[PDB]
Structures are given as structure tokens and as C-alpha cells.
Motif scaffolding. Structure first.
Motif, PDB file in Angstrom:
ATOM      1  N   UNK A 151       0.753  -1.140   0.054  1.00 31.66           N
ATOM      2  CA  UNK A 151       0.014  -0.144  -0.006  1.00 31.66           C
ATOM      3  C   UNK A 151       0.929   1.335   0.113  1.00 31.66           C
ATOM      4  N   UNK A 152       2.062   1.122   0.324  1.00 29.38           N
ATOM      5  CA  UNK A 152       3.098   2.256   0.420  1.00 29.38           C
ATOM      6  C   UNK A 152       3.666   2.383  -1.136  1.00 29.38           C
ATOM      7  N   UNK A 153       3.307   1.778  -2.205  1.00 33.21           N
ATOM      8  CA  UNK A 153       4.073   1.575  -3.299  1.00 33.21           C
ATOM      9  C   UNK A 153       3.021   2.460  -4.350  1.00 33.21           C
ATOM     10  N   UNK A 184       8.360  13.833  -1.733  1.00 32.04           N
ATOM     11  CA  UNK A 184       8.508  12.814  -0.416  1.00 32.04           C
ATOM     12  C   UNK A 184       9.766  12.085  -0.590  1.00 32.04           C
ATOM     13  N   UNK A 185       9.796  11.076   0.403  1.00 35.93           N
ATOM     14  CA  UNK A 185      10.885  10.176   0.552  1.00 35.93           C
ATOM     15  C   UNK A 185      10.488   8.906   0.103  1.00 35.93           C
ATOM     16  N   UNK A 186      11.181   8.432  -0.812  1.00 40.56           N
ATOM     17  CA  UNK A 186      10.833   7.136  -1.436  1.00 40.56           C
ATOM     18  C   UNK A 186      12.130   6.421  -2.034  1.00 40.56           C
ATOM     19  N   UNK A 201       8.852  -0.649 -16.391  1.00 40.63           N
ATOM     20  CA  UNK A 201       8.046   0.021 -15.364  1.00 40.63           C
ATOM     21  C   UNK A 201       8.935  -0.083 -14.059  1.00 40.63           C
ATOM     22  N   UNK A 202       8.538   0.429 -13.038  1.00 39.40           N
ATOM     23  CA  UNK A 202       9.223   0.798 -11.745  1.00 39.40           C
ATOM     24  C   UNK A 202       8.010   0.981 -10.752  1.00 39.40           C
ATOM     25  N   UNK A 203       8.562   0.580  -9.387  1.00 41.47           N
ATOM     26  CA  UNK A 203       7.991   0.936  -8.094  1.00 41.47           C
ATOM     27  C   UNK A 203       8.526   1.908  -7.415  1.00 41.47           C
ATOM     28  N   UNK A 204       7.412   2.782  -6.876  1.00 40.71           N
ATOM     29  CA  UNK A 204       8.047   3.765  -5.908  1.00 40.71           C
ATOM     30  C   UNK A 204       7.598   3.417  -4.292  1.00 40.71           C
ATOM     31  N   UNK A 261       1.524   4.163   3.203  1.00 41.57           N
ATOM     32  CA  UNK A 261       0.458   4.363   2.387  1.00 41.57           C
ATOM     33  C   UNK A 261       0.051   6.034   2.505  1.00 41.57           C
ATOM     34  N   UNK A 262       0.105   6.427   3.551  1.00 43.46           N
ATOM     35  CA  UNK A 262      -0.145   8.041   3.770  1.00 43.46           C
ATOM     36  C   UNK A 262       0.724   8.655   3.075  1.00 43.46           C
TER      37      UNK A 262
END
Length: 101
Positions: free
Chosen positions: A7-9, A30-32, A47-50, A55-56
Motif C-alpha cells: 500500500x506504500x507503493x 516525498x521520501x521514496x 516499469x518501476x515501483x516507488x 500508504x499515507x
């Protein structure tokens, strides 16, 4: 707790191969950390995942994205965002939340 990581992605995809993946950070706040997937053999996009800290923070970053809000055929909300390339060229990439619950 796997789901709270997920959920944080944010999912960034349809990225043309001429886009350096480090340039993807310019459209996120933000910080990722960015995890880049290799393009398939003879493939043209990747593709890529941040991954954010929660999740907020991921939801906050997705709202901050400067891009056109649209809905794909599956009914998923996605943002189309322009990447300014050093070659004066450009790319459209698609960003959405990883988890759509």
C-alpha cells in the motif's frame, strides 16, 4: 504486513526505454526509493515501483503528481505525467497506486 508495504507503493509504467530511470524521481515528491524492472527482451517500455514509508505518504505523493487524471478500462484511476528529457524530447508515463482496494 506485506500489504502495508504494498500500500506504500506507486506503480510507474509504460515508461519508454529512452527515459533514464533516475529521471522518474523528478515527478515524485516525498521520501521514496525506486525499484526498476528490466524491459522484456526486444521490449520498448519498462516499469518501476516507488516505495514510500507508509500508504499515507504514498497517497500524499500521488495527489501531488502534476499530471492528467484518467480512468483505464479496468476502472483504475491513473495519472499521465510528462517527463522532460535532456534531449529536449519528452515521454508520457502512467502512475497509479499499487493496491486498488
Amino acid at each position: 504486513s506485506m500489504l502495508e508495504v504494498e500500500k506504500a507503493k506507486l506503480f510507474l509504467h509504460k515508461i519508454p526505454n529512452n527515459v533514464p530511470s533516475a529521471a522518474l524521481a523528478q515527478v515524485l515528491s516525498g521520501k521514496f526509493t525506486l525499484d526498476v524492472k528490466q524491459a522484456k527482451t526486444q521490449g520498448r517500455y519498462y516499469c518501476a515501483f516507488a516505495l514510500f514509508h507508509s500508504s499515507e505518504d504514498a497517497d500524499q505523493a500521488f495527489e501531488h503528481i502534476d499530471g492528467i487524471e484518467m480512468t483505464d478500462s479496468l476502472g483504475l484511476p491513473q495519472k499521465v505525467v510528462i517527463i522532460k528529457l535532456s534531449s529536449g524530447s519528452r515521454a508520457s508515463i502512467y502512475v497509479r497506486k499499487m493496491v486498488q482496494d
